[PDB]
Write a protein that binds this ligand. Structure first.
Ligand SMILES: *[C@@H]1O[C@H](CO)[C@@H](O[C@@H]2O[C@H](CO)[C@@H](O)[C@H](O)[C@H]2NC(C)=O)[C@H](O)[C@H]1NC(C)=O
Ligand SMILES: *[C@@H]1O[C@H](CO)[C@@H](O[C@@H]2O[C@H](CO)[C@@H](O)[C@H](O)[C@H]2NC(C)=O)[C@H](O)[C@H]1NC(C)=O
Ligand SMILES: *[C@@H]1O[C@H](CO)[C@@H](O[C@@H]2O[C@H](CO)[C@@H](O)[C@H](O)[C@H]2NC(C)=O)[C@H](O)[C@H]1NC(C)=O
Ligand SMILES: *[C@@H]1O[C@H](CO)[C@@H](O[C@@H]2O[C@H](CO)[C@@H](O)[C@H](O)[C@H]2NC(C)=O)[C@H](O)[C@H]1NC(C)=O
Ligand SMILES: *[C@@H]1O[C@H](CO)[C@@H](O[C@@H]2O[C@H](CO)[C@@H](O)[C@H](O)[C@H]2NC(C)=O)[C@H](O)[C@H]1NC(C)=O
Ligand SMILES: *[C@@H]1O[C@H](CO)[C@@H](O[C@@H]2O[C@H](CO)[C@@H](O)[C@H](O)[C@H]2NC(C)=O)[C@H](O)[C@H]1NC(C)=O
Ligand SMILES: *[C@@H]1O[C@H](CO)[C@@H](O[C@@H]2O[C@H](CO)[C@@H](O)[C@H](O)[C@H]2NC(C)=O)[C@H](O)[C@H]1NC(C)=O
Ligand SMILES: *[C@@H]1O[C@H](CO)[C@@H](O)[C@H](O)[C@H]1NC(C)=O
Ligand SMILES: *[C@@H]1O[C@H](CO)[C@@H](O)[C@H](O)[C@H]1NC(C)=O
Ligand SMILES: *[C@@H]1O[C@H](CO)[C@@H](O)[C@H](O)[C@H]1NC(C)=O
Ligand SMILES: *[C@@H]1O[C@H](CO)[C@@H](O)[C@H](O)[C@H]1NC(C)=O
Ligand SMILES: *[C@@H]1O[C@H](CO)[C@@H](O)[C@H](O)[C@H]1NC(C)=O
Ligand SMILES: *[C@@H]1O[C@H](CO)[C@@H](O)[C@H](O)[C@H]1NC(C)=O
Ligand SMILES: *[C@@H]1O[C@H](CO)[C@@H](O)[C@H](O)[C@H]1NC(C)=O
Ligand SMILES: *[C@@H]1O[C@H](CO)[C@@H](O)[C@H](O)[C@H]1NC(C)=O
Ligand SMILES: *[C@@H]1O[C@H](CO)[C@@H](O)[C@H](O)[C@H]1NC(C)=O
Lengths: 167, 204, 418, 50
């Protein structure tokens, strides 16, 4: 197999050789020579996303390793969703452009490099509320909003015999 | 903006492409081409290869059919939603907030689109608001007065009754207001003179 | 044999009407699942974890691994979209003023508590405390619980300080004692009822909020829907993992055992059997997840509609925003879901009265404008339909229509002339 | 295979013999005796509704 052998505190009984888990794959073993306990864990595995603005704009990308510490892999960031490499970190907060996760979103801005930042929900607005104050509009705007809804998909069909066993 | 429709088309295309590409899979046979196997092996030996290909292609077809069923269920949910919006927003005027466009709804104008429908929700929206000092009621002669349809406001010196959604101040008469009870239960009440048009005519 | 309820005949008759004389401001908790766990399964790592021969054999199946990941990523994007639609209904993050002089009501049990690290209100905290590596990765949601709590706080502040206008356009402040008067006038009860009973209504609302808090804190069998969603997802993942231990006809379910005990020409058959079995299992799991995600998407669209039509504004849809007449709603976050507290106005104490469709004064039938004619036996009054507030019959509250020869059931009386 | 051999306007290279398709079905072929490129379109098919 393959894994990261570590010292473990599992209390093996003298007769017991190796442990298992739900998937029945060996998880902990006993070294044949020195009768100690070795926990076996998968080395490391994670998706690799390529946060990129439109190539029509720029050819610079920032790579997100999902759910891996920034030790097992310029600019490095440790988001709760993984290690983001190649994206600058900006204390400012803007609207989400390229979602990453855990409130972190990236974008392409200003001499322009991919920035990563904790997104902002909106602009603070403290309503001047009081028990004897009412705000009444004196003017109105009529607007037209477009709302697009699918209705029907493509009416398709497949000849089972001619597809599987064409002629 | 048309993404919601574009995706639909795109999705369908992808499936067909994937389905077609499934014909380029050996599925454990010697060649993805059925005619090569037919012309290269005797039936007793070609049976295994053709069975492998048939199993793979049939499984791919079942997966595609299931994906189509689920995606058509999604599209049917969207079509029912669009039918409801057409029946309510267009053929009438809905009070359902944000259902027929943000703001207050006035009317809608359906428009076709490839495999979809686009509504142009017309919405009235309040624009420029002004502060005012209000009061839940007004005492005239020991009797609380509440507005029939509107709200009491005041620019600081005089009190008026104006409709909620548009500042059109009017004098506080016994026609805008109805009386109920004494001048103690209501919390936040204020004093003012509720003019009565009947009296000056009576004097005349 | 199951019982459908208490038999209850209604004393109906052509001249009898029951009118309430009081009310109850109930608060109903409604729980909806908005999103589920965003998971992604690495097809090759799952079926053929670290085995060149197994990976090569799997490759022969075309794209039976690059399409499942597409579906799962689509599900994850759909989950984020569901949460965004349900909660991100408000353009600007409002916040309540430092004072809490809301005409007598008390929202301390639903507004955020700054003391706790995450600014989640008390009921949100109760809700959170009431709900509890083989190629299957669990992605984190785009919106953290803190951001969802901020969105719910923004909606609460908007509802409290501005009623429904904050969802229609620029937010407009209005005293809460007058916002509730607007709500009451909406459900037909004239606003002179709210103001005169303001203290009683405030006490009823506070007691209802306290009862909701106690019910959530005591009854562990309340957040059934969210807990069921979480359990179903975890159970599906557990079943998918346990499927790895089945031989499917192979000599062993451990890939390394087969690789280390056979030559490739012989081990390929066993590895193909295992690959087919595990691929079938993974496809079944993906289909189950697609259907369950469709269910959750329907629930999330319903929750977004409830948020838009109840919180951002009063709704007259019967039983849509809680049993009874609807005044307002207060949203709350919850683990993988939302929880509305629907405030509802329920008439409680009714009295019988002898009614009449119209009243004849001088040969002219009179009909009420907004109300109904009721009499305590000898004297007739016209009162609003949802609260017994009798008033003398005048020419204002009543309008005339023709003579008194056609209106069935009409009764005689003297109509006062102010 | 079965198809309707039709004269094609494809531009085969001197070293090419088969013109494959997205589905790995030989769509264009080079006639060995006369070096011209011929397409291969399936004859015809469809549903028969009643
Ligand atoms: C209400 O707002 C509208 C804008 O929507 C005002 O219309 C503008 O009036 C000014 C006059 O000073 C014109 O120069 C603008 O061109 C008008 N706008 C448009 C879009 O035509 C209107 O005057 C406002 N009403 C009040 C009473 O203030
Ligand atoms: C508040 O509104 C009242 C209603 O008009 C204003 O009173 C009028 O003010 C104008 C402006 O000078 C005078 O020409 C009228 O004679 C006033 N009428 C009455 C009945 O007082 C008042 O000025 C407004 N207050 C402010 C601060 O603008
Ligand atoms: C509204 O006016 C009434 C009378 O015009 C005020 O009531 C008087 O208040 C004074 C001050 O305490 C008392 O000395 C009188 O005995 C009250 N008379 C009556 C008939 O109530 C009332 O206070 C005024 N409203 C406000 C808010 O000041
Ligand atoms: C409407 O119901 C409320 C209670 O829901 C009544 O208020 C109660 O009144 C009694 C007698 O005055 C008190 O002992 C209780 O403490 C009150 N309860 C509350 C919560 O305040 C009210 O009286 C009823 N309406 C009418 C007209 O009687
Ligand atoms: C709203 O209700 C809460 C109760 O949940 C009130 O908080 C209580 O306040 C009293 C007096 O200050 C304390 O003795 C209690 O220990 C508090 N309880 C809790 C749970 O905080 C709060 O004061 C009320 N707000 C208003 C404006 O009345
Ligand atoms: C029905 O209601 C009427 C009016 O509310 C009652 O008539 C009044 O009764 C009180 C009771 O003492 C008298 O003080 C008033 O002078 C009466 N006014 C009129 C105009 O009649 C009547 O008593 C009520 N009857 C019943 C059975 O409830
Ligand atoms: C209501 O009052 C009217 C008039 O006061 C009644 O009409 C009278 O009915 C009697 C019965 O036959 C006739 O003799 C009179 O000529 C009618 N007069 C008028 C002016 O119509 C009517 O009957 C009364 N109805 C009730 C239910 O009390
Ligand atoms: C194995 O042999 C080595 C050297 O002979 C010795 O150091 C070690 O303790 C032995 N261990 C066991 C379990 O016999
Ligand atoms: C790239 O974007 C610009 C503006 O954003 C547009 O004018 C141009 O047509 C785009 N080109 C391509 C190839 O998409
Ligand atoms: C990464 O490793 C460092 C070093 O031990 C540790 O401090 C940190 O908490 C780790 N972070 C994660 C996300 O595992
Ligand atoms: C953000 O601000 C903190 C404290 O103000 C600082 O320590 C940190 O370096 C800043 N980040 C960047 C990228 O400058
Ligand atoms: C009402 O007065 C307050 C006082 O500070 C102010 O902040 C607010 O902007 C005023 N209302 C409007 C609509 O400007
Ligand atoms: C409104 O609040 C202020 C705050 O001090 C208070 O003085 C005033 O009496 C209150 N008015 C009403 C009607 O509650
Ligand atoms: C009205 O009268 C009927 C007649 O029996 C009675 O059952 C009912 O309880 C009365 N109404 C009320 C509110 O009690
Ligand atoms: C109401 O119903 C009773 C039932 O017996 C009948 O006697 C009476 O005439 C009816 N009156 C009207 C006005 O319908
Ligand atoms: C093949 O032979 C025939 C007859 O001998 C001749 O007409 C034809 O041109 C030949 N093919 C080529 C490619 O020369």
């Amino acid at each position: 197999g393959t894994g990261v052998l570590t010292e473990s505190n599992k209390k093996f009984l003298p007769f017991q050789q190796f442990g298992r888990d739900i998937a029945d794959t060996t998880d902990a073993v006993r070294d044949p020579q020195t009768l100690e306990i070795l926990d076996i864990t998968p080395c490391s595995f994670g998706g690799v996303s390529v946060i990129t603005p439109g190539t029509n704009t720029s050819n610079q990308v920032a790579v997100l390793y999902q759910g891996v510490n920034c030790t097992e892999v310029s600019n490095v960031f440790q988001t709760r969703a993984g290690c983001l490499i190649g994206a600058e970190h900006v204390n400012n907060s803007y609207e989400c452009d390229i979602p990453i996760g855990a409130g972190i979103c990236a974008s392409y801005q200003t001499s322009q490099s991919i920035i990563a930042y904790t997104m902002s929900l909106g602009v603070e607005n403290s309503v001047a509320y009081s028990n004897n104050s009412i705000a009444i509009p004196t003017n109105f705007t009529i607007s037209v909003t477009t709302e697009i809804l699918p209705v029907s998909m493509t009416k398709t069909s497949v000849d089972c015999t001619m597809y599987i066993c064409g002629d | 903006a048309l993404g919601k429709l574009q995706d639909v088309v795109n999705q369908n295309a992808q499936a067909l492409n994937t389905l077609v590409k499934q014909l380029s899979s050996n599925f454990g046979a010697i060649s993805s081409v059925l005619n090569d196997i037919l012309s290269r092996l005797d039936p007793p030996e070609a049976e295994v290869q053709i069975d492998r290909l048939i199993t793979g292609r049939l499984q791919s077809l079942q997966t595609y059919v299931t994906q189509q069923l689920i995606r058509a269920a999604e599209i049917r949910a969207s079509a029912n939603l669009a039918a409801t919006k057409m029946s309510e927003c267009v053929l009438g005027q809905s009070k359902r907030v944000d259902f027929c466009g943000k703001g207050y709804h006035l009317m809608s104008f359906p428009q076709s689109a490839p495999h979809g429908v686009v509504f142009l929700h017309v919405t009235y929206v309040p624009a420029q608001e002004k502060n005012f000092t209000t009061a839940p009621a007004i005492c005239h002669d020991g009797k609380a007065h509440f507005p029939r349809e509107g709200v009491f406001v005041s620019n600081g010196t005089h009190w008026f009754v104006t409709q909620r959604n548009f500042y059109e101040p009017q004098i506080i008469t016994t026609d805008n207001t109805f009386v109920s009870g004494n001048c103690d239960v209501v919390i936040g009440i204020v004093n003012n003179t509720v003019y009565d048009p009947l009296q000056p005519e009576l004097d005349s | 044999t199951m019982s459908l309820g208490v038999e209850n005949s209604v004393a109906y008759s052509n001249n009898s009407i029951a009118i309430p004389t009081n009310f109850t401001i109930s608060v109903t908790t409604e729980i909806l699942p908005v999103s589920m766990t965003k998971t992604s399964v690495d097809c090759t790592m799952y079926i053929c974890g670290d085995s060149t021969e197994c990976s090569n054999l799997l490759l022969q199946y075309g794209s039976f691994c690059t399409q499942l990941n597409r579906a799962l990523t689509g599900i994850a994007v759909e989950q984020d979209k569901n949460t965004q639609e349900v909660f991100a209904q408000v353009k600007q993050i409002y916040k309540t003023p430092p004072i809490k002089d809301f005409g007598g009501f008390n929202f301390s049990q639903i507004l955020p508590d700054p003391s706790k690290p995450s600014k989640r209100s008390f009921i949100e905290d109760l809700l959170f405390n009431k709900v509890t590596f083989n190629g299957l990765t669990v992605l984190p949601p785009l919106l953290t619980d803190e951001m969802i709590a901020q969105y719910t706080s923004a909606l609460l502040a908007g509802t409290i300080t501005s009623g429904w206008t904050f969802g229609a356009g620029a937010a407009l402040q209005i005293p809460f004692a007058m916002q509730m008067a607007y709500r009451f006038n909406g459900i037909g009860v004239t606003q002179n009822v709210l103001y005169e009973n303001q203290k009683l209504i405030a006490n009823q609302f506070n007691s209802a909020i306290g009862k909701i808090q106690d019910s959530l804190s005591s009854t562990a069998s309340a957040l059934g829907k969210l807990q069921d969603v979480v359990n179903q997802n975890a159970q599906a993942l557990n079943t998918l993992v346990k499927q790895l231990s089945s031989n499917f006809g192979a000599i062993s379910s451990v890939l390394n055992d087969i690789l280390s005990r056979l030559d490739p020409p012989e081990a390929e058959v066993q590895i193909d059997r295992l690959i087919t079995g595990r691929l079938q299992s993974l496809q079944t799991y993906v289909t189950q997840q697609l259907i369950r995600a469709a269910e959750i998407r329907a629930s999330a669209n319903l929750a977004a509609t409830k948020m838009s039509e109840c919180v951002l504004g009063q709704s007259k849809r019967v039983d849509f925003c809680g049993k009874g007449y609807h005044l307002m709603s207060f949203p709350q976050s919850a683990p993988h879901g939302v929880v509305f507290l629907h405030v509802t106005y329920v008439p409680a104490q009714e009295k019988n009265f002898t009614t009449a469709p119209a009243i004849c004064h001088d040969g002219k039938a009179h009909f009420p404008r907004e109300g109904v004619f009721v009499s305590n036996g000898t004297h007739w009054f016209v009162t609003q339909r949802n609260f017994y507030e009798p008033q003398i019959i005048t020419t204002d509250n009543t309008f005339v229509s023709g003579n008194c020869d056609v209106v069935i059931g009409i009764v005689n009386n003297t109509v006062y002339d102010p």
